[PDB]
């Protein structure tokens, strides 16, 4: 078929696996939330809690479908849905490598529902405690072991896909024993090889060397916010591309559709982007179609905290806080354009 609607394998869509309701996880997970003392702002700060009541949850946004449960099967299934409804092939997950029975279930759920849409999984790599070179070789062979064999587990020209959040915590010395085929731990060569893709934070003259030397695949930007970092600068996409191409690199810039964090980060204003009834997202993602990559990453799906959700967010206006909401738009408004943006980048690939 030749529609213009079928999924894209090379957009991948940052999801969120860690929101609960009190009836199927034992209480509102996340949508509770600690909010964040101000970094700058001295000592004795007291700065509480979001308690995640229907009135007051931890977003400055308010989900279509509510405090849902990222473990109810029928939640999975719109979300899924709204995936095919963006034309985004791929759910980038989350993982925390929390150990537990409840996280090993919800992971299984979500990779049964994407394939019934065809929709497939990857995983994105947290920094969670004491995260090392050896615990992650240790967890991506786990997650190969468990999922390699699933059908909705992704795979590019026959290698599994990870995203490694702040990879710039551990040394390239350390990466290197892990990613050069010559390395002490190597995954090259095995059955446990993937495609690491790291996150570009900061400057070329750190790292361009950063990521030779740690022999990542590619690199990612992550934050939705436009200037946050060098690497969430659009105008540096161009020559970013440039440099990946030469050495070899897969570069996979991220675009959003705006950030806020504020209930959460109160202190955190001036990474405000305003989504100006879709403006910016168009003109994020036309940046990441024009540099000429050849794969995309959304921040995000449902990183509802941080306000860069493309999932439908509806008016609500309670007691405690007035939410915003898609102003001129309609709450599938995002999903559509992402939609729209997926033929675009198509039309741009050979
Ligand atoms: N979701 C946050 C932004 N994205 C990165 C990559 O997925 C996450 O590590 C990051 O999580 C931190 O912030 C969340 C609130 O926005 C917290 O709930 C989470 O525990 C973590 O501190």
Request: proline share 6%.
């Amino acid at each position: 078929n030749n529609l213009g609607t079928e999924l894209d394998y090379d957009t991948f869509c940052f999801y969120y696996d860690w929101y609960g309701s009190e009836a199927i996880d034992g209480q509102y997970r996340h949508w509770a939330h600690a909010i964040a003392p101000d970094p700058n702002g001295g000592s004795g700060q007291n700065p509480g809690t979001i308690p995640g009541t229907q009135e007051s949850i931890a977003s400055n946004f308010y989900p279509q479908l509510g405090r849902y449960s990222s473990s109810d099967p029928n939640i999975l299934t719109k979300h899924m849905d709204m995936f095919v409804m963006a034309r985004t092939g791929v759910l980038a997950l989350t993982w925390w490598n929390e150990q537990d029975e409840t996280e090993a279930k919800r992971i299984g759920l979500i990779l049964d529902a994407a394939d019934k849409k065809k929709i497939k999984v990857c995983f994105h790599l947290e920094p969670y405690p004491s995260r090392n070179v050896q615990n992650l070789r240790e967890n991506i062979v786990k997650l190969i072991t468990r999922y390699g064999n699933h059908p909705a587990f992704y795979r590019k020209d026959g290698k599994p896909l990870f995203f490694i959040y702040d990879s710039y915590l551990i040394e390239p010395s350390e990466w290197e024993k892990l990613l050069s085929p010559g390395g002490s731990i190597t995954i090259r060569n095995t059955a446990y090889d993937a495609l690491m893709i790291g996150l570009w934070t900061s400057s070329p003259t750190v790292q361009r060397p950063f990521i030779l030397n740690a022999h990542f695949d590619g690199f990612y930007t992550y934050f939705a916010a436009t200037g946050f970092t060098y690497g969430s600068t659009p105008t540096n996409w161009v020559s970013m591309q440039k440099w990946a191409k030469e050495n070899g690199k897969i570069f996979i810039p991220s675009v959003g559709p705006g950030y806020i964090d504020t209930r959460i980060r109160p202190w955190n204003g001036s990474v405000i982007r305003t989504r100006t009834d879709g403006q910016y997202y168009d003109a994020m993602y036309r940046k990441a179609i024009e540099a000429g990559v050849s794969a995309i990453s959304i921040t995000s799906f449902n990183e509802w905290h941080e306000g860069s959700q493309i999932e439908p967010a509806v008016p609500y206006t309670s007691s405690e806080f007035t939410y915003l909401d898609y102003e001129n738009r309609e709450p599938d408004y995002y999903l559509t354009r992402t939609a729209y943006w997926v033929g675009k980048f198509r039309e741009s690939k050979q």
